[PDB]
Amino acid sequence: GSLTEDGLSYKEKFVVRSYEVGSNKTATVETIANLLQEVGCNHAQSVGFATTTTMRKLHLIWVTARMHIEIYKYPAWGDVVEIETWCQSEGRIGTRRDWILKDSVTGEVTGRATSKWVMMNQDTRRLQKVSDDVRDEYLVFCPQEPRLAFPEENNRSLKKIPKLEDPAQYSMIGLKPRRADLDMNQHVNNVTYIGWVLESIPQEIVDTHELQVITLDYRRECQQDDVVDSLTTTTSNDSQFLHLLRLSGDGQEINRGTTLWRKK
Amino acid sequence: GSLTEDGLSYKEKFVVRSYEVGSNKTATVETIANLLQEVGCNHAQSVGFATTTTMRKLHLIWVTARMHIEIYKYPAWGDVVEIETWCQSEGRIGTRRDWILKDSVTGEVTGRATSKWVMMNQDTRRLQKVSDDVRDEYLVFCPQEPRLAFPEENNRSLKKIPKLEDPAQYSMIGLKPRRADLDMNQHVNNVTYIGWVLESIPQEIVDTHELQVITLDYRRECQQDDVVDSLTTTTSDSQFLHLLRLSGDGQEINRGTTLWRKK
Ligand SMILES: Clc1cccc2[nH]cnc12
Numbered sequence A: 001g002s003l004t005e006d007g008l009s010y011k012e013k014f015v016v017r018s019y020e021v022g023s024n025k026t027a028t029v030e031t032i033a034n035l036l037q038e039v040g041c042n043h044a045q046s047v048g049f050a051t052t053t054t055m056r057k058l059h060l061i062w063v064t065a066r067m068h069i070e071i072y073k074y075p076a077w078g079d080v081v082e083i084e085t086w087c088q089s090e091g092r093i094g095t096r097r098d099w100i101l102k103d104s105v106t107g108e109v110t111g112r113a114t115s116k117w118v119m120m121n122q123d124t125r126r127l128q129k130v131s132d133d134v135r136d137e138y139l140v141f142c143p144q145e146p147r148l149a150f151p152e153e154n155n156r157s158l159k160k161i162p163k164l165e166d167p168a169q170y171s172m173i174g175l176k177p178r179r180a181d182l183d184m185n186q187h188v189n190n191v192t193y194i195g196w197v198l199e200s201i202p203q204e205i206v207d208t209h210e211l212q213v214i215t216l217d218y219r220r221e222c223q224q225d226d227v228v229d230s231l232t233t234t235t236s237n238d239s240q241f242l243h244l245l246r247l248s249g250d251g252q253e254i255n256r257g258t259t260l261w262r263k264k
Numbered sequence B: 001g002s003l004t005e006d007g008l009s010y011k012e013k014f015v016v017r018s019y020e021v022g023s024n025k026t027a028t029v030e031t032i033a034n035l036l037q038e039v040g041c042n043h044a045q046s047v048g049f050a051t052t053t054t055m056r057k058l059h060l061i062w063v064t065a066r067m068h069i070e071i072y073k074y075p076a077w078g079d080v081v082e083i084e085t086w087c088q089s090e091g092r093i094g095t096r097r098d099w100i101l102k103d104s105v106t107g108e109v110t111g112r113a114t115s116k117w118v119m120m121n122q123d124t125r126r127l128q129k130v131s132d133d134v135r136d137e138y139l140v141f142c143p144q145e146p147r148l149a150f151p152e153e154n155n156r157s158l159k160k161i162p163k164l165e166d167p168a169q170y171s172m173i174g175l176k177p178r179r180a181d182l183d184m185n186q187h188v189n190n191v192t193y194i195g196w197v198l199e200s201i202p203q204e205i206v207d208t209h210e211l212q213v214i215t216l217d218y219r220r221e222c223q224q225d226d227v228v229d230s231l232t233t234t235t236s237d238s239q240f241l242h243l244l245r246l247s248g249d250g251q252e253i254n255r256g257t258t259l260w261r262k263k
């Protein structure tokens, strides 16, 4: 992978692996999400990081608040996908990382994603607005003119997500993370929550439809010793669902989301 | 990746990814196992396949009976690992696939693995000795002189594994596969069973030791709707005996052993 000529974005190519594909012999949305994470990490590494000198001193970290992915064509096993990523501040609220996925051969856009990140103290887990000293350290690595993966006016990435009310139409109960679900800091990988959301989609949908859009809000972290219930209700040729992940016991919310599926 | 000059083995390089590493910032044994599977698949693709024309007509498939992996150094995040793989028949019993892992920069061997595969009818799940017409179709893609990743006679890869007796010293119960654990044919990926075996190793061991050897026998498949219990007892460097079995009736799906060395 490499930073582009202007040094304000990063591009990397990936060959889709045999264990990365589903029943259609195309990459799953979890493989795509893992590739977005990888290109994000390689981008931070290329520019010197993803915490700054001031963030490490203050025990501050970036945490995902929302992930929004739209896939037009999932890459097939053996195909090469090219992914371009960049960051931009949104004032003191936080930062946005965007991605564009392309077919390496045709140059056609096959997907796009956006994520909203907030600053949080690693120890107290208390959120905070981005300081000016921290903001200044990041500004030189972001484009100054707005560059959005989702420029559209009434676009899906910014829609508010309601809370699913019991009884859910479908559920998957007792989901727990294993060591493979953890990252290098022993925290549950963000992509695991996407998998858990999709566990409560009925098999018939997975067999007849393809996942087009997924928007996920992250409210609370699942600890290594927590157990999760995944709930889904149909809200709708296109099927739409409302999703809720909550702790098995008291029902504390960890995530909420929506998916849009189109007939194959 | 590419077939080597003689066309009898296959080599491919991999850059270790951020989500592929554990707390030591080095690749997990499940990432290694996924990479072995990937290089095996690319090898079959490069030579025309993973079944032959005759196997497809008779509804026959290759299935793993045993996996044995030995890692000396796990590759760090961002490092390049080179893996070479080849196959060899073992008479009509089945076939063996071997692998050698190397540090791309130093050329030093960092790991090795061997697996034993048997032929099975995919519908009836009945085992079968290979035959002659099927054997002949494969022979031209294998070396003729023996080439073993574990040459030593009566080495760790060939040791018989006993059945763990209750009560187990440690256990992880209620393990179930999710869609990410399935392969392209909707069967549980073989690497998932490695993860499930390791779930019952105590955290203290994972924190103070590194996994050096893992041998796993595959007796029965976990179906998409099955629930598994992972059992472990210390038999000792630390060594453990492992058993995976269905949550209800306790039908055995896998047995194995691990060897761990102090960090
Ligand atoms: Cl990791 C990284 C690379 C470039 C720009 C960034 N802004 C916030 N984090 C960034």
Ligand SMILES: Clc1cccc2[nH]cnc12
Residues within 6 Å of the ligand: B040, B043, B044, B045, B047, B049, B050, B086, B087, B088, B095, B138, B141, B142
């Ligand atoms: Cl897939 C594959 C490649 C080369 C040799 C083989 N023998 C059995 N299967 C093989």
